Design a protein around this motif. Structure first.
Motif, PDB file in Angstrom:
ATOM      1  N   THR A  57      13.639 -17.710 -41.013  1.00 46.44           N
ATOM      2  CA  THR A  57      13.287 -18.892 -41.667  1.00 46.44           C
ATOM      3  C   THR A  57      13.187 -19.778 -40.319  1.00 46.44           C
ATOM      4  O   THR A  57      14.039 -20.142 -39.905  1.00 46.44           O
ATOM      5  CB  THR A  57      14.501 -19.494 -42.353  1.00 46.44           C
ATOM      6  N   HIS A  65      11.075 -22.819 -39.862  1.00 46.86           N
ATOM      7  CA  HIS A  65      11.344 -24.300 -40.172  1.00 46.86           C
ATOM      8  C   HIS A  65      11.775 -24.606 -41.542  1.00 46.86           C
ATOM      9  O   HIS A  65      12.354 -23.354 -42.251  1.00 46.86           O
ATOM     10  CB  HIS A  65       9.941 -24.914 -39.870  1.00 46.86           C
ATOM     11  N   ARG A  66      11.890 -25.747 -41.906  1.00 45.52           N
ATOM     12  CA  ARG A  66      12.745 -26.123 -43.603  1.00 45.52           C
ATOM     13  C   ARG A  66      12.103 -25.400 -44.386  1.00 45.52           C
ATOM     14  O   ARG A  66      12.940 -25.139 -45.212  1.00 45.52           O
ATOM     15  CB  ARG A  66      12.618 -27.748 -43.417  1.00 45.52           C
ATOM     16  N   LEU A  67      10.747 -25.386 -44.253  1.00 43.47           N
ATOM     17  CA  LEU A  67      10.059 -24.771 -45.599  1.00 43.47           C
ATOM     18  C   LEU A  67      10.461 -23.290 -45.665  1.00 43.47           C
ATOM     19  O   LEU A  67       9.532 -22.864 -46.540  1.00 43.47           O
ATOM     20  CB  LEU A  67       8.654 -25.231 -45.626  1.00 43.47           C
ATOM     21  N   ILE A 125      12.814 -21.929 -46.978  1.00 42.04           N
ATOM     22  CA  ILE A 125      13.471 -21.797 -48.144  1.00 42.04           C
ATOM     23  C   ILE A 125      12.793 -22.818 -48.925  1.00 42.04           C
ATOM     24  O   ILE A 125      13.032 -23.929 -48.883  1.00 42.04           O
ATOM     25  CB  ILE A 125      14.823 -21.891 -48.072  1.00 42.04           C
ATOM     26  N   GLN A 126      12.507 -22.436 -50.342  1.00 40.38           N
ATOM     27  CA  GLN A 126      12.090 -23.438 -51.364  1.00 40.38           C
ATOM     28  C   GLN A 126      12.685 -22.918 -52.715  1.00 40.38           C
ATOM     29  O   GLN A 126      12.971 -21.787 -53.007  1.00 40.38           O
ATOM     30  CB  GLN A 126      10.485 -23.353 -51.217  1.00 40.38           C
ATOM     31  N   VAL A 176      18.506 -31.314 -36.434  1.00 38.06           N
ATOM     32  CA  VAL A 176      18.029 -29.957 -36.830  1.00 38.06           C
ATOM     33  C   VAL A 176      16.454 -30.155 -37.308  1.00 38.06           C
ATOM     34  O   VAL A 176      15.954 -29.170 -37.158  1.00 38.06           O
ATOM     35  CB  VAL A 176      18.785 -29.592 -37.866  1.00 38.06           C
ATOM     36  N   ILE A 177      15.930 -31.151 -38.046  1.00 38.10           N
ATOM     37  CA  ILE A 177      14.754 -30.969 -38.454  1.00 38.10           C
ATOM     38  C   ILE A 177      13.824 -31.069 -37.257  1.00 38.10           C
ATOM     39  O   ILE A 177      12.835 -30.324 -37.223  1.00 38.10           O
ATOM     40  CB  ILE A 177      14.500 -32.275 -39.290  1.00 38.10           C
ATOM     41  N   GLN A 191      13.932 -27.420 -35.248  1.00 40.04           N
ATOM     42  CA  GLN A 191      12.744 -26.534 -36.104  1.00 40.04           C
ATOM     43  C   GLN A 191      11.423 -27.036 -36.082  1.00 40.04           C
ATOM     44  O   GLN A 191      10.844 -26.075 -36.260  1.00 40.04           O
ATOM     45  CB  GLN A 191      13.440 -26.252 -37.678  1.00 40.04           C
TER      46      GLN A 191
END
Lengths: 79, 49, 1334, 149, 50
Positions: free
Chosen positions: C412, C414-416, C418-419, C901-902, C905
């Protein structure tokens, strides 16, 4: 409503506040057997609250009135 | 392996990103059907009980 | 149950005994015939608890008849077996032993005792005595003693002194010493002598004794006398199925220490000779050391497999430690894994295999089955689930719906990664995924596996739908650019539909709607690409959000007209009247979201995917061998390129040309041939269609399938079709040099065996880094997220004052990031006003969305002051107005969300992708110079004599269009403020010759210039016009090296010529390599010279490490006249003489070129020495704004080079956390110069500058630390304990007695509490209100 | 040679042929390259990768779910996706990933029972993977407590 | 019976598969003529000539 929560945010003004109010409603809506104020049309417990927010029937300050009047009248019932 | 008719064209996005589309014919003709042999073991020991 | 904080300290032996429920004295663990533990053994049920639930050892009391009695026959308390995980025992040692953490790690036992580390080891090994107390003056406390030297003390004094051997001697030394006396003594004497080399040592001792003051921690607990044992359930010895056993190595170490501890007990009553008791005590010390850490002090003790035994310190250290593999990364329940496959599915839908759903939702099926009343008992429920009756699927179709399920793809980035996805049951085996989200997942259907995760609680099912749903995530967190762009097949169909040909079918007909064009295409009467006339009625919102219609006739093709029934009534028709490439679709999707909203955008994106797939299928695109065309001139170009090879080869064999020139010429001709082939190849691929219609002949765009696949941007680029058809460039062997023989053939023609062997080097080298450098990217991202732990928004607007400068990036080349893009998402700092004065768009705080961006774009504004994250004055966080609007949502950021954290990443994701004399004006503009020292040359033009001036290109609007650095002492052809057109060489200077041009004019006579002592007599062999030669210190005579050769300017009378307007002397000093051009007696004019002085991923990763460059740039810390003192003693000195202040001198290398001279003046923070800038010195001299501007301008270079766009706000947020420490220079509340937190400095001045005090506080100095070091420098001991140097962090926190407030994100991750971010933030406000109100 | 063979094979020299669709039966606008290519079946079978665990094996020392499909263990939720979760801001999901999913002996049983009773009520507690850490640090002779209120 | 995505041909720089596909069609065309004349049995010598 069911695909998106775009219109639910403006009724509260914050993305993070949807969960803390919708789950708060759904707690009693599920375990306390409270009658939903919105048509249910074959929907789960975690989505009818969102459909109601999309209408805006409830808001943070007015969840604490219908529940507090209940204990208020219980006080008279107890004494 | 096997050999068969092969085309080169998108098919309604069913071969979007390196995806591969096949026929019911290859399953019916059992071209790619394979055999796998497993084994199992039933150990029988002498327990103090 | 609820706690408030976590306390870490040292364990007093009494408290260890308090924890313990018994003393283990028997090294044996369990019986062999029977399998029960023995009494007072390592698994003694009395000490630790019963082996089975509610059962004693024999059976006197059981079956809950007796609740908690202790069986008198055995001594075992009866209770649950969970108590075995809680109860701990202790080991009673005979000789006190030293802990290894506070002994080997750095010292914590040596610093406290101020003793050498080596001597501590010598005393430990029973080799060197120590004087605990010297009754006489001959001896001294803490003296090293050898045995032979100690015999003299025995025969001299004996009882008068106290000196013994062993670790207990160190324990007695700790007992005897007093730290308050050291506190009152060392501090006073420290002020007497301010030696900087020992200043930090005394400071460290003072800090240690102070920390011991309030810790209540007596250092006598350093030497371990009683040792706690791990609970047996955690060092388990479990029987295997095959009648075998296996146990943790900790059990072996415990047995080992006990075996020699009891032996040591037996060696006392036996009156052992001291020589063997020393050996036994060494055995015990080594055993306990290995128990704490196996391979730390001595050889790593192994077992029977010669592999080193893993001590319990290893259980928490490293990647295999618990902090990473069991606390942060955990196995999860109610989850599964399967392969991924493509879907027709909608953007919020996912294809679940019907078989995995019943397994995942099995408790849900059980719960809803009893509600249905179909199963009286849960056993029947499970039975009918096992039978897989038709009823379970009937219940399943409602359990799944309205219940989102998380999807995961390892890794994983970056943030995307997990969706959320609303499941759709598929009678298959694989997981079907929506095609449009594959790019975000970086997943291709080539065997990739996905991880499925179902949320259980009501909030989780709610959080996934409200925030994690795929429909919500359209824009990237890194930048507002959309992420649901069609990748390869939808764009191909869109391109094919949006194509034009002039001879296809049904051309020129007039039609009255798009719908009846679709029927024309479907009927086959008219072709897809056919320029026709269509009636289109579009909609616009010129009103106050109300749509207005307009009908008109447009000239378009049928394919584009079909698209108009797909647009959501909110776009201009001109957005689809093009070829509609990939970037066109990207900007179309962006426009739909920016104009209409989100739901219309989602529906439009789904319909575009459907239309693209359908029409790509309808068209049909293949890859024919005839499609790979080959230019006819390939052989001709190859022949005419190798023709010059013979010329180059014959020139080389003749000898008139060099090998380097040979190589350069052959590579140049090969590059030219490569360009010629590339052009000739693309000529037959873009306009190859020669088709005629009601004429003679006309040329249109190509219809080659490869040409569409490249032009549309679906797959590949034009740089690859060259390898398809032309020669495959030139390959470089792995050393770095490039082979001059290129691969003339292509893949269509096939390659040569030697050609393939040459090409394989590029293949291996390209893939080797990917197989290796991704680990570097992962480590960098891990380091970045650590310093981004507690970066959460706390307020909305802290109301801070002015912030950071903003400007375009015109420096170096053209404009790459204009102000239009660099301020979108910013909040101003000051009331920025238009070029029209007193016209302000902002009350110091506005959200710079597109409207204000266009408003400033229309004006000639070039500088805006925005509220930066660094400028934020919020304590323990940042405020929303100091950050700006969100990028994924576009609105202003609300409180609670985490940004660190955003950003980590955001910058850590593309890291795996980025592994590898004259000035001419280009456009008409003014010639402006900033901070220019004007001087007129001999020809009446303008010349420069300042390094700190840069050329500026000003247009009619006023803003600077282009800028080019001009060095010191250059010659210009034009003046300042000249509006000249492009194509003029305005600046001319020799790349090597550095002049010493004199600003004043007059006679020049050779002064302070004596032959034979400082200089040499040299004359040019051709001209004769020469002068005395001044060489460097390494070539000139040492007799005249004391004084710098100075050539003052004189007159006919012979007086110094001063600066016009200032009474300071104007004379020039000659460094080495300064040969005077003119002879003596002749003069120079203004602007003339005296003497001529001739002359990847880690690249961005090391910045956060604050790596010192090998050749840093030296600058000045105060202004005034610069001077030089000591000469040639290791390194030269640099005297600084300001107007009033102080002899600031430092080691300066004379071997490197300088900018100013003895007679010149330089200000603070200016380039006197050349080389890459050191960020530490940039912070030390100039403000944090300068260094953060440098960093954002620097790291942006790599991402621009790789075409990756990242919002600049994602960098200084890390930089804001780099700038967290602060060194005090004043006093009043803390030590003299100890390093503290900037927040602590701010809160300490929140009561001394307020009404609580007049003035007692101290002033600080901003400090910068590396990304690894700054992570450790926190008030939290558990945050850094889970990242790196776990042993060091723990041993540092334990001696300091720290306590953690559980403020960081991962702090609540480890303890399992709610995460103080967003929903957890709104929950934590209640806890903050709790402790305040008592 | 391919062109000569195709001429021998009574087939188009270009190598691509026009096709009709199986749905609507129309000729495609462009000829499609159709031929024969040696396909292979790899060992990575889909059923060998499909795995799902609702409640199964549990580890001994850490009490977390086991790993591996053959062991009927659950998937591993590493810190990499923990960072993604906390970047989203969904704290309840992240909390349940670490408390009621893996390491609460008295928590996941209640999580099972109440959802069996149709109650999606969260009752978290201390993770079991932290008591082990506290016990180990205490075994190091390093005192560590929890400062309660 | 199998349809492959053509977009993976140019970007992946694997063009030998296209030649393999054409040669496979050539071989199968030879086979379709061979079995066609075999089912009719014009002549063994005619087969020996073809």
């Amino acid at each position: 409503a069911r695909v998106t929560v775009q219109d639910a945010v403006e009724k509260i003004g914050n993305r993070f506040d949807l969960v803390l109010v919708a789950a708060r409603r759904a707690r009693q809506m599920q375990v306390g057997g409270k009658d939903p104020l919105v048509p249910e049309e074959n929907d789960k417990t975690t989505v009818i609250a969102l459909r109601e927010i999309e209408e805006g029937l409830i808001n943070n300050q007015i969840l604490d009135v219908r529940e507090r009047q209940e204990q208020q009248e219980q006080e008279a019932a107890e004494l | 392996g096997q050999n068969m008719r092969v085309a080169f064209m998108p098919w309604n996005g069913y071969n979007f990103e390196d995806s591969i589309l096949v026929s019911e014919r290859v399953v019916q003709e059992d071209r790619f059907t394979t055999i796998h042999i497993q084994e199992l073991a039933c150990v029988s020991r002498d327990t103090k009980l | 149950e609820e706690f408030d904080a976590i306390k870490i300290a040292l364990a007093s032996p009494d408290m260890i005994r308090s924890w313990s429920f018994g003393e283990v004295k028997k090294p044996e663990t369990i019986n062999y015939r029977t399998f029960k533990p023995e009494r007072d053994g390592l698994f003694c049920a009395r000490i630790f608890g019963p082996v089975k639930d509610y059962e004693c050892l024999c059976g006197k009391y059981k079956r809950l008849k007796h609740r908690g009695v202790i069986c008198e026959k055995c001594g075992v308390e009866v209770t649950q077996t969970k108590v075995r995980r809680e109860r701990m025992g202790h080991i009673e040692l005979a000789s006190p032993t030293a802990h290894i953490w506070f002994l080997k790690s750095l010292s914590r036992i040596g610093l406290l005792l101020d003793m050498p580390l080596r001597d501590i080891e010598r005393v430990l090994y029973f080799e060197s005595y120590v004087v605990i107390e010297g009754g006489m003056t001959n001896l001294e406390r803490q003296q090293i003693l050898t045995e032979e030297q100690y015999l003299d003390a025995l025969e001299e004094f004996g009882d008068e002194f106290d000196a013994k051997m062993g670790a207990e001697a160190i324990q007695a030394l700790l007992k005897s010493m007093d730290l308050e006396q050291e506190c009152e003594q060392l501090r006073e004497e420290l002020n007497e002598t301010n030696s900087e080399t020992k200043r930090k040592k005394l400071t460290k001792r003072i800090k240690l004794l102070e920390a011991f003051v309030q810790s209540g921690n007596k250092p006598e607990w350093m030497i371990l006398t009683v040792l706690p044992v791990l609970p047996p359930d955690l060092r388990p010895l479990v029987p295997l199925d095959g009648g075998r056993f296996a146990t943790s190595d900790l059990n072996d170490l415990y047995r080992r220490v006990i075996n020699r501890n009891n032996r040591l007990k037996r060696l006392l009553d036996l009156a052992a000779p001291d020589i063997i008791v020393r050996n036994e005590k060494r055995m015990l010390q080594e055993a306990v050391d290995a128990l704490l850490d196996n391979g730390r002090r001595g050889r790593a003790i192994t077992g029977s497999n010669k592999r080193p035994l893993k001590s319990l310190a290893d259980m928490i250290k490293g990647k295999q430690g618990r902090f990473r593999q069991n606390l942060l990364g955990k196995r999860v329940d109610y989850s599964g894994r399967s392969v991924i496959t493509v879907g027709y599915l909608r953007l919020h839908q996912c294809g679940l295999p019907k078989k995995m759903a019943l397994e995942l939702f099995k408790p849900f099926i059980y719960g809803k089955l009893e509600l249905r009343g179909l199963a009286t008992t849960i056993k029947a429920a499970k039975k009918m689930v096992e039978r897989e009756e038709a009823v379970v699927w009937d219940i399943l179709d409602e359990v799944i719906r309205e219940h989102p399920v998380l999807l995961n793809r390892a890794p994983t980035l970056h943030r995307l990664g997990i969706q959320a996805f609303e499941p759709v049951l598929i009678e298959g085996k694989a997981i079907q995924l929506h095609p449009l989200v594959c790019a975000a997942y970086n997943a291709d259907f080539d065997g990739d596996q996905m991880a499925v995760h179902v949320p259980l609680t009501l909030e989780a099912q709610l959080e996934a739908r409200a925030l994690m749903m795929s429909t919500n995530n359209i824009l990237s967190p890194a930048n507002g650019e959309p992420i649901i762009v069609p990748s390869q097949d939808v764009v191909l169909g869109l391109y094919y539909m949006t194509r034009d040909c002039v001879n296809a079918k049904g051309e020129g007909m007039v039609l009255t709607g798009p719908k009846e064009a679709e029927r024309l295409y479907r009927s086959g009467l008219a072709s897809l690409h056919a320029r026709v006339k269509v009636r289109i009625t579009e909609y616009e919102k010129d009103a106050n959000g109300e749509l207005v219609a307009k009908t008109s006739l447009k000239d378009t093709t049928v394919g584009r007209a079909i698209l108009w029934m797909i647009v959501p009534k909110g776009l201009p028709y001109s957005i689809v009247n093009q070829a509609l490439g990939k970037k066109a679709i990207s900007k179309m999707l962006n426009t739909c979201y920016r104009i209409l909203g989100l739901k219309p955008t989602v529906i439009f994106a789904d319909q575009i995917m459907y239309t693209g797939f359908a029409y790509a299928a309808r068209s049909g695109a293949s890859v024919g061998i005839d499609d790979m065309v080959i230019p006819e001139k390939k052989h001709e170009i190859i022949s005419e390129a190798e023709a010059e090879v013979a010329e180059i080869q014959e020139q080389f064999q003749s000898g008139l040309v060099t090998a380097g020139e040979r190589y350069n010429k052959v590579i140049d001709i090969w590059a030219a041939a490569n360009d010629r082939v590339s052009k000739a190849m693309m000529d037959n691929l873009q306009t190859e269609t020669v088709i005629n219609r009601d004429g003679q002949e006309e040329k249109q765009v190509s219809f080659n399938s490869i040409y569409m696949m490249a032009d549309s941007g679906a797959r590949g680029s034009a740089a690859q079709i060259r390898q398809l058809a032309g020669m495959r460039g030139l390959m470089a062997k792995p050393d770095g040099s490039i082979i001059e023989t290129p691969i003339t053939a292509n893949f269509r023609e096939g390659l040569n065996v030697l050609q393939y062997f040459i090409s394989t080097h590029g293949a291996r080298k390209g893939l080797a880094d990917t197989a290796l450098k991704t680990a570097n990217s992962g480590y960098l991202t891990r380091r970045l997220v650590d310093v981004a732990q507690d970066l959460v928004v706390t307020e909305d607007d802290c109301g801070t004052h002015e912030g950071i400068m903003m400007t375009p990036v015109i420096e170096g080349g053209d404009v790459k990031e204009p102000l239009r893009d660099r301020v979108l998402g910013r909040v101003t700092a000051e009331d920025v006003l238009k070029p029209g004065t007193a016209d302000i768009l902002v009350p110091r705080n506005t959200l710079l969305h597109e409207q204000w961006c266009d408003l400033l774009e229309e004006n000639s504004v070039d500088a805006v002051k925005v509220r930066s994250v660094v400028s934020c004055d919020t304590d323990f966080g940042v405020c929303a107005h100091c950050y700006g609007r969100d990028l994924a949502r576009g609105h202003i950021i609300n409180k609670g969300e985490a940004i660190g954290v955003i950003a980590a990443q955001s910058i850590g994701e593309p890291g795996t992708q980025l592994t590898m004399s004259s000035i001419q004006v280009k456009n008409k503009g003014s010639i402006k110079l900033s901070n220019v020292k004007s001087v007129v040359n001999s020809s009446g033009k303008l010349v420069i004599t300042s390094r700190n001036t840069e050329l500026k290109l000003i247009d009619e609007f006023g803003r600077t269009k282009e800028s080019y650095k001009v060095p010191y002492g250059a010659v210009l052809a034009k003046g300042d403020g000249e509006q000249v057109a492009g194509g003029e060489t305005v600046a001319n200077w020799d790349p090597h010759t550095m002049p010493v041009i004199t600003e004043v004019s007059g006679f020049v006579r050779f002064t302070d210039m004596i032959d034979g002592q400082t200089i040499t007599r040299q004359t040019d062999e051709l001209t004769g016009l020469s002068s005395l030669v001044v060489l460097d210190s390494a070539e000139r005579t040492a007799g005249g090296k004391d004084l710098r050769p100075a050539l003052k300017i004189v007159d006919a009378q012979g007086n110094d010529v001063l600066i016009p307007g200032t009474d300071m002397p104007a004379q020039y000093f000659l460094p080495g390599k300064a040969i005077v051009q003119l002879e003596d007696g002749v003069q120079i004019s203004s602007g003339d010279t005296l003497a001529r002085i001739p002359q990847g991923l880690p690249r961005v990763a090391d910045l956060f490490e604050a790596r010192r460059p090998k050749e840093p740039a030296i600058l000045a810390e105060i202004s005034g006249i610069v001077s030089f003192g000591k000469e040639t003693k290791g390194k030269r000195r640099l005297v600084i003489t300001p107007v009033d202040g102080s002899p600031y001198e430092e080691m300066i290398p004379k071997w490197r070129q300088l900018n100013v001279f003895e007679g010149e003046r330089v200000e603070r923070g200016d380039v006197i020495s050349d080389g890459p800038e050191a960020p530490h010195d940039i912070l030390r001299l100039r403000g944090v704004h300068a260094v953060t501007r440098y960093i954002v301008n620097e790291v942006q270079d790599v991402y621009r080079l790789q075409g990756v766009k990242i919002n600049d706000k994602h960098i200084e947020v890390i930089v804001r956390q780099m700038l967290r420490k602060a060194t005090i220079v004043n006093a009043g509340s803390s030590d003299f110069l100890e390093g503290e937190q900037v927040e602590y400095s701010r809160v300490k001045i929140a009561n001394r500058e307020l009404e609580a005090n007049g003035k007692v506080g101290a002033t600080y100095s901003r400090d910068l630390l590396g990304i690894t070091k700054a992570s450790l420098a926190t008030e939290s001991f558990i945050s850094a304990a889970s990242f790196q140097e776990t042993t060091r962090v723990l041993t540092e926190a334990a001696v300091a007695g720290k306590r953690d407030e559980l403020r960081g994100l991962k702090e609540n991750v480890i303890v399992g509490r709610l995460i103080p971010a967003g929903t957890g933030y709104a929950y934590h406000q209640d806890r903050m209100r709790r402790r305040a109100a008592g | 040679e391919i062109k000569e063979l195709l001429k021998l094979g009574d087939l188009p020299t270009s190598g691509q042929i026009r096709l009709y669709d199986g749905r609507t039966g129309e000729q495609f606008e462009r000829p499609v390259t159709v031929g024969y290519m040696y396909m292979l079946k790899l060992n990575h079978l889909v059923d060998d990768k499909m795995h799902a665990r609702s409640t199964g094996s549990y580890s001994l020392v850490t009490q977390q779910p086991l790993g591996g499909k053959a062991q009927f263990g659950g998937q591993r939720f590493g810190e990499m996706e923990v960072w993604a979760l906390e970047a989203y801001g969904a704290a309840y999901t992240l909390q349940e990933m670490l408390t009621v999913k893996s390491d609460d002996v008295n928590g996941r049983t209640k999580m099972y029972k109440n959802i069996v009773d149709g109650n999606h009520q969260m009752e978290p507690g201390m993770p079991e993977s932290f008591n082990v850490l506290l016990k180990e640090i205490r075994s190091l002779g390093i005192n560590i407590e929890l400062e309660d209120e | 019976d199998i349809v492959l995505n053509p977009l993976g041909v140019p970007s992946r720089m694997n063009i030998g598969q296209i030649l393999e596909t054409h040669l496979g069609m050539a071989a199968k065309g030879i086979g379709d003529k061979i079995n066609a004349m075999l089912k009719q049995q014009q002549e063994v010598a005619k087969l020996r000539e073809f």
